[PDB]
Chains A and B, each alone.
Chain A
Amino acid sequence: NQQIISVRNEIQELKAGKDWHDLQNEQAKLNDKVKLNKRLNDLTSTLLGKYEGSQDSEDDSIRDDSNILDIAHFVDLMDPYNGLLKKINKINENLSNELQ
Chain B
Amino acid sequence: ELRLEDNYVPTSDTLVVFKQLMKLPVTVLYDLTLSWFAKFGGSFDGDIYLLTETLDLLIEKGVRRNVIVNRILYVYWPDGLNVFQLAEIDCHLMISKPEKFKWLPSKALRGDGKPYVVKLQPAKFIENLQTDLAKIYHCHVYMFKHPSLPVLITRIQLFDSNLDKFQGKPLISRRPYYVAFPLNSPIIFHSVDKDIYARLVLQSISRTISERETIIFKPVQKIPVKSIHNIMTLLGPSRFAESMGPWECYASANFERSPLHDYKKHQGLTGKKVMVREFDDSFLNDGKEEPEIRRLRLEKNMIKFKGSANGVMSRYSSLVPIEKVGFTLKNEINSRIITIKLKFNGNDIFGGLHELCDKNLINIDKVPGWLAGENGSFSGTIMNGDFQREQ
Contact = CB atoms under 8 A, between A and B. Distances in A.
Q: Do chains A and B touch in the complex (CB under 8 A)?
A: yes
Task: Identify whether the interface residues of A are mostly helix, strand, loop, or mixed.
Answer: helix
- Interface range, B side: 10 to 19
Nearest to A5: B200
A4 B214 contact: no
Given A5-B196, A8-B207, A13 B112 contact: no
Given A1-B136, A1-B196, A5-B196, A12 B203 contact: yes
A28 to B, nearest CB: 14
Contact of B111 (A2, A5, A8, A21): A21
A17 interface: yes
Given A4-B136, A12-B214, A18 B199 contact: no
A22 to B, nearest CB: 9
A8 B208 CA distance: 12
A15 B111 contact: yes
Contacts, number: 35
B183 interface: no
Interface string B205-227: 01100000011100000000000
Contacts of A1: 136, 196, 200
A9 interface: yes
Nearest to A21: B111
A76 to B, nearest CB: 37
B81 interface: no
Nearest to B200: A5
Given A1-B136, A4-B136, A12 B111 contact: no
A81 interface: no
Contacts of B109: 16
Given A16-B109, A16-B111, A21-B112, A5 B203 contact: yes
Interface of B: 109-113, 136, 196, 199-200, 203, 206-207, 214-216
